[PDB]
């Protein structure tokens, strides 16, 4: 009758580890997503009954290797470009006035410089239009902004920065569970778990105080945070209905080409056909004064049922983080969302708003700072639309007495932008054996 | 919301003996011993555990939402402010002499 | 050594600025929050607020919005780090002695603080 070991292979059964995720794509751009192996026709998914794990993010690992791996996939796209060295020189700009509107005047230089030609003892001299924002005096005569702290690196004009969606599977011996809640906080037990063998398709879209272009909730508004009462900590917001914002940059742009030595190529910015006006983002005033009256119904229930809460305008900063920062077909915008977060909500028109928006070409993208990158123009007219799905917001601090909490716009931290995607999933790994008794037992022969 | 008290404005134990200090501190909680004219240092993180580089006679322990800071075998050099910290929020600290 | 170094002392009329350095020197600069504590003669501290210096983005109390403004600055070797703090608008109360300080996790623990600088009116 007593009992004997009997042994089982195969028994559903798993613990939390971390592995490298491999990324599948559909069907050149800088993701390099021409080297992934190409979905599956079909996106099994299995429900498991009466099973509840437990979820964390702001702990996941997913997060710190997607963060990882398009960092190094955006240098590997910068290797074989071409070398800016000569462009360190000294410029000589002057005001572009042609047909300007009054809010652009100073915002475009007219600079001219001599450059290396294909032989070693020949130079040019040769004209471009430069930013503002890209050059500096020399002694109060310009030169680039970053010719003391880096190097600058831009050609392949056929790599695209348009954002490709991307699936992560994961290897064999491992599964991918999913949290199917609708009502999900960040952490604790979800109780209606399924899984999948990968992820859906995520936009690695980069932006700071807005994310644009993601998910959004299926029942309400969220608000999710670690430790709400510290104020250290970020509070990332997300809508149940999209924003929609409309950029452009009304601008008709030339673009030259300056043969610098043999094989390599300057892509300068000639003369604009037609009149010089800014660019800018225009956003409907009723829909937004709406989601942003849902977000202080939920906003309340963390805080005093009678408490005044205000939006106001980031406090200081770096460019990147003072203002809403992306990128819109190859151009770089920060525009200003100073209009957007001004108001106060206590307790108990029709047309739209225009938020004003600066270009630049230096770009220093991941705060790395030993390497720049050049952003070649773009010929004709530039014009997006996007759905805004979500915030970044931070708290001040030092509230005492319970009453006027503040809300300012954050960011700067992209992997905030990757836990807005994968709060859903985690990685397990499985454990195929296992032993328990019973009462048959060996025939010995 | 937090809520912060501390409960001997100042003792004066003195020479040898022990003395406890008690916090009551809704939320972590942290210790500080500061001379006059001088920055603080951090003594005892979290409530429970001491940073590396203290004598041993420090030590808190907690229960509830009360904490309680001690120190035995009293020295003449251990005669400063003491106070508890919670995050943005201080509290005038106490004294203690001889 | 994690030394956080702090300049002299400095004493103005009213209304007028002040500014109060505040130097880092031995490790990973640019993964810890640096806060600033103000104590009054025979007070306790007072937070004056917090600075990302990754971003650079500050965070101030609602009693000194407007007045403070909190920046930092790197060099060309990246080792190290000056943080400042400006005052704009002074008056009597502002006299002081203020810290630097150095975050070191999440339960706020100030392990490293700075020497102190007075400052009066």
């Known amino acids: 009758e007593n009992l004997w070991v009997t042994v089982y292979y195969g028994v559903p059964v798993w613990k939390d580890a971390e592995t490298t995720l491999f990324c599948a794509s559909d069907a050149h751009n800088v993701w390099a997503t021409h080297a992934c192996v190409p979905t599956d026709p079909n996106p099994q998914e299995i429900h498991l009954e009466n099973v509840t794990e437990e979820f964390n993010m702001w702990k996941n690992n997913m997060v710190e290797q997607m963060h990882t791996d398009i960092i190094s996939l955006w240098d590997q796209s910068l290797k074989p470009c071409v070398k800016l060295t000569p462009l360190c020189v000294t410029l000589q700009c002057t005001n572009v006035t042609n047909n300007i509107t009054d809010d652009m005047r100073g915002e475009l230089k007219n600079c001219s410089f001599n450059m290396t030609t294909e032989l070693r003892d020949k130079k040019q001299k040769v004209y471009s239009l430069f930013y503002r924002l890209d050059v500096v005096q020399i002694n109060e005569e310009y030169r680039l902004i970053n010719c003391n702290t880096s190097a600058i690196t831009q050609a392949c004009p056929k790599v695209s920065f348009e954002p490709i969606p991307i699936h992560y599977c994961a290897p064999a011996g491992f599964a991918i569970l999913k949290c199917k809640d609708k009502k999900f906080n960040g952490t604790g037990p979800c109780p209606s778990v399924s899984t999948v063998q990968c992820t859906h398709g995520i936009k690695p879209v980069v932006s700071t105080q807005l994310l644009l272009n993601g998910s959004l909730a299926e029942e309400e508004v969220m608000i999710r945070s670690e430790n709400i009462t510290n104020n250290a900590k970020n509070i990332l917001v997300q809508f149940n209905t999209p924003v929609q914002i409309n950029c452009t940059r009304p601008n008709n742009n030339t673009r030259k080409s300056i043969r610098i030595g043999p094989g390599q190529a300057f892509y300068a910015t000639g003369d604009i056909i037609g009149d010089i006006r800014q660019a800018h983002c225009n956003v409907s005033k009723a829909t937004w004064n709406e989601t942003l009256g849902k977000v202080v119904k939920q906003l309340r229930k963390h805080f005093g049922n009678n408490t005044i809460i205000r939006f106001a305008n980031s406090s200081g900063g770096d460019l990147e983080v003072t203002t809403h920062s992306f990128n819109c077909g190859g151009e770089f915008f920060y525009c200003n969302t100073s209009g957007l977060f001004n108001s106060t909500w206590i307790s108990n028109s029709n047309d739209s708003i225009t938020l004003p928006c600066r270009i630049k070409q230096i770009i220093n993208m991941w705060q790395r700072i030993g390497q720049a990158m050049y952003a070649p123009p773009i010929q004709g007219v530039i014009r997006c639309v996007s759905n805004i799905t979500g915030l970044i917001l931070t708290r001040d601090g030092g509230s005492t007495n319970s009453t006027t909490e503040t809300f300012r716009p954050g960011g700067g931290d992209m992997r905030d932008n990757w836990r807005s995607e994968l709060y859903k999933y985690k990685v397990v790994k499985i454990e195929p054996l296992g032993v328990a008794p019973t009462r048959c037992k060996r025939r010995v022969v | 919301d937090i809520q912060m008290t501390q409960s001997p404005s100042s003792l004066s134990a003195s020479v040898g003996d022990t003395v406890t200090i008690t916090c009551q501190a809704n939320g972590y909680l942290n210790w500080y011993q500061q001379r006059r004219g001088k920055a603080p240092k951090l003594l005892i993180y979290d409530g429970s555990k001491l940073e590396r580089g203290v004598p041993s006679r420090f030590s808190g322990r907690r229960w509830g939402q009360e904490y309680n800071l001690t120190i035995n075998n009293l020295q003449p050099e251990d005669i400063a402010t003491y106070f508890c910290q919670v995050y943005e929020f201080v509290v005038p600290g106490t004294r203690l002499d001889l | 050594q994690v030394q956080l170094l702090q300049s002299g002392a400095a004493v103005t009329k009213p209304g007028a600025s002040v500014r109060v350095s505040c130097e880092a020197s031995?490790?990973?600069?640019?993964?810890?929050?640096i806060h600033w504590w103000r104590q009054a003669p025979g007070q306790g501290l007072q937070w004056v607020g917090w600075?990302?210096?990754?971003?650079?983005?500050?965070?101030?109390?609602?009693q000194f919005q407007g007045r403070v403004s909190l920046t930092r600055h790197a060099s060309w070797d990246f080792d190290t780090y000056s943080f400042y703090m400006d005052l704009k608008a002074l008056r009597s109360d502002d006299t002081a002695v203020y810290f630097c300080?150095?975050?070191?996790?999440?339960?706020?623990?100030?392990?490293?603080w700075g020497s102190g600088t007075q400052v009066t009116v």
């Open positions: 600075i990302n210096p990754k971003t650079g983005q500050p965070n101030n109390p609602r």
């Open positions: 300080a150095r975050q070191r996790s999440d339960y706020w623990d100030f392990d490293v």
């Open positions: 031995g490790y990973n600069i640019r993964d810890y929050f």
